[PDB]
Structure 1
Amino acid sequence: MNPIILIIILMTVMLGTIIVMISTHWLLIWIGFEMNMLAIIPIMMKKHNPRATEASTKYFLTQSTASMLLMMAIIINLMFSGQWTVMKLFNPMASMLMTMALAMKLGMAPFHFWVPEVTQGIPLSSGLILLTWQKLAPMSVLYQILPSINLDLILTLSILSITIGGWGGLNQTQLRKIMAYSSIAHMGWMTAVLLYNPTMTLLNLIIYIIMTSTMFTLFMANSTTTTLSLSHTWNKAPIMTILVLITLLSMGGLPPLSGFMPKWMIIQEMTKNDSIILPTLMAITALLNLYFYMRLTYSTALTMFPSTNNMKMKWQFPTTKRMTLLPTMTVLSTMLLPLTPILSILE
């Protein structure tokens, strides 16, 4: 791609998400989602192979269906309220359709079935955009309509996302599908605390974006898309095994790491509202996520898989890749738990 065209298209992706974040009219919400989808389609077809076209086709169909359900929710809101303010909705049918549309955009279960496919079909940078930046606009719309969201629906979507993202990653060896099922489980954790305390939703989103950006940046810096090529990292760059170790132990939520920070705070807000069974079962289900994280750490950091002979050639060349913000994101995704009361800046 022309680098100017890449810059303009990424600015248009950012422009669509910012238009979702700043607008007060539902048509401009729908326009921001349309602009976001339209501009992110060339990011997914960056390498021009049939898997990228299949992934972009599946992504287009799911996001287009969600955009139509979003506009139907908007139009039913205009029926039953005669206005367009991006606020609570004035009909439970429009609220259900908008919650379904945003669950389709986030890829929350049972609308999750596109997320491990599309992330597999696209490069690591476009998968990073899809799993970090593409969550921000629907979580903003869910942030602003929470006086109308059905509790039973949002918690059903949450627990179904956490369980299916837990069981889905246990069978994987491809790293992008592992990050995609990790995405489904973490979006379940974000929407489970939305009606209780949306500041903890924003906290979980920020810590998730930091940890996912760290893991995709490590996968780009080591050029590894599979488990078994990630296991060659100790013979190529031994520091990267330490970094994937501490970041995967963070993403499982082990204290004293910072990925323990969101889910604990989520439990801290779900027991105030007299829900004990639900965050307990959520926390027990997150052990599955931690299990396949531990599988990746056993393959990469804590053991040494056998390498090949041609690795000895790559010993003579340092990494020329711009590992952008990788030490910053590595420090932030691990050593941030002593600064847990910083979360009040998200209120």
Structure 2
Amino acid sequence: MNPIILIIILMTVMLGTIIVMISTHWLLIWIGFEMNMLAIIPIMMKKHNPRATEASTKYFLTQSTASMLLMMAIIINLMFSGQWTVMKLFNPMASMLMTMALAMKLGMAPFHFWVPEVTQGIPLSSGLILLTWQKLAPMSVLYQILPSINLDLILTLSILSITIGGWGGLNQTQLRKIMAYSSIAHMGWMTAVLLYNPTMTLLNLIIYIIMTSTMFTLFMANSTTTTLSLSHTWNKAPIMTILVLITLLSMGGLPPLSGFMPKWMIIQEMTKNDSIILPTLMAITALLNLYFYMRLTYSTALTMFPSTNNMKMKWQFPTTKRMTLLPTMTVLSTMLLPLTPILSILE
């Protein structure tokens, strides 16, 4: 791919997301979603492998069904309201259709089946672009329509996403599938608090974006795709293993790291509304996310798996990858707890 064409395609993705974010018309939301899908399709086809083609086909079919359901919801709201302003919807059927459309777009369970599939078949940079940038626009659309969101449906989707993400990440050996199931659990966390306080949804979105960016940047820097190469990383560079141990510690919500910051705040907005069973259940389920993070830290940094003879050659060459914002994202994702009230800038 040409650098100019790749740059133009990336700005097209950014323009589509911005168009969804800044528009006050439903047709422009739909237009931005199609812009985003059409411009992100070739990034998944960067290597021209059969797995990339199948992943792009599955992503295309799921996004097409989601966009068509979104247009059906827009048309129903047009009929029953006579206007296009992006605000609360004026039909429960249109609200339900739009909610399941955005759940299919975000990868919420039980529409999650493409997320561990697709992320396995695409490169690491494209998977990072997916799992971080593609989740901004549907979360904005969910933010704007929360007066019409059914509570039962969104809480069912949240608990299903958290449980299925934990039980799915409990099994994998590949890193990309682990990050996919972790993403599913995290969006269950973010949507569980949406109807009570969306500022916590914004805070959890930002923290999840920083953590996923740090982990994917570490994986790109070490060129690791399975757990065994991540185990091998201890011989080549120990500082990378220390960084992935600290980041995986923070991703599990272990205090005093910054990953304790979102979910705890979420509990603080759900015991105010006298809902005690749900946050306790969600923390108990997120213990499984902590479990497979602990398994990864056991394999990587807390022990030393055996290495090979050719690794000695890799001792003679310094790394030359542009590890952009890796120290900043490592610091920001782990020592951000003593600046917890800064979330008030998102209110």
TM range (shorter): over 0.9
TM-score of the superposition, structure 1-length normalised? 1.00
CA shift, 1:332, in A, is: 0.5
TM-score of the superposition, structure 2-length normalised? 1.00
- Size of the aligned set, in residue pairs, is 347
What per-residue deviation string (whole Å, max 9, x for no partner) do you get for residues 263-292 of structure 1? 000001011011100000000000000000
Distance in 2 (CA, whole Å) between partners of 1:90 and 1:237 is 57
CA shift, 1:262, in A, is: 0.3
Alignment of 1:124-139 (within 5 A): 124-139=124-139
CA shift, 1:12, in A, is: 0.4
Misfit runs of 4+, over 3 Å? none
Distance in 2 (CA, whole Å) between partners of 1:311 and 1:18 is 45
Distance in 1 (CA, whole Å) between partners of 2:201 and 2:311 is 43
Identity in percent = 100
Distance in 1 (CA, whole Å) between partners of 2:97 and 2:250 is 35
CA shift, 1:313, in A, is: 0.4
CA shift, 1:116, in A, is: 0.3
Distance in 1 (CA, whole Å) between partners of 2:124 and 2:77 is 38
Distance in 2 (CA, whole Å) between partners of 1:319 and 1:109 is 39
SS in 2 for 1:270: coil
SS in 1 for 2:148: coil
What per-residue deviation string (whole Å, max 9, x for no partner) do you get for residues 188-213 of structure 1? 00000000000000000000000000
In the alignment, which residue of structure 1 is the partner of 2:188? 188
Distance in 2 (CA, whole Å) between partners of 1:254 and 1:66 is 35
- The CA RMSD measured in Å over matched residues stands at 0.4
Alignment of 1:238-249 (within 5 A): 238-249=238-249
Distance in 2 (CA, whole Å) between partners of 1:176 and 1:47 is 17
What per-residue deviation string (whole Å, max 9, x for no partner) do you get for residues 214-273 of structure 1? 000000000000001110111011001011001001000000000110000000101101
Distance in 2 (CA, whole Å) between partners of 1:339 and 1:232 is 35
> Structure 1 residue 146 and structure 2 residue 143: aligned?
no
CA shift, 1:58, in A, is: 0.3
What per-residue deviation string (whole Å, max 9, x for no partner) do you get for residues 87-140 of structure 1? 111001000000000000000000000000000000000000110000000000
What per-residue deviation string (whole Å, max 9, x for no partner) do you get for residues 14-44 of structure 1? 0000000000000000001000000000000
Uncovered stretches (5+) of structure 2, i.e. residues with no partner: none
Uncovered stretches (5+) of structure 1, i.e. residues with no partner: none
CA shift, 1:146, in A, is: 0.3
In the alignment, which residue of structure 2 is the partner of 1:174? 174
SS in 2 for 1:315: helix
What per-residue deviation string (whole Å, max 9, x for no partner) do you get for residues 156-210 of structure 1? 0000000000000010000000000000000000000000000000000000000
Distance in 1 (CA, whole Å) between partners of 2:261 and 2:307 is 36
In the alignment, which residue of structure 2 is the partner of 1:5? 5
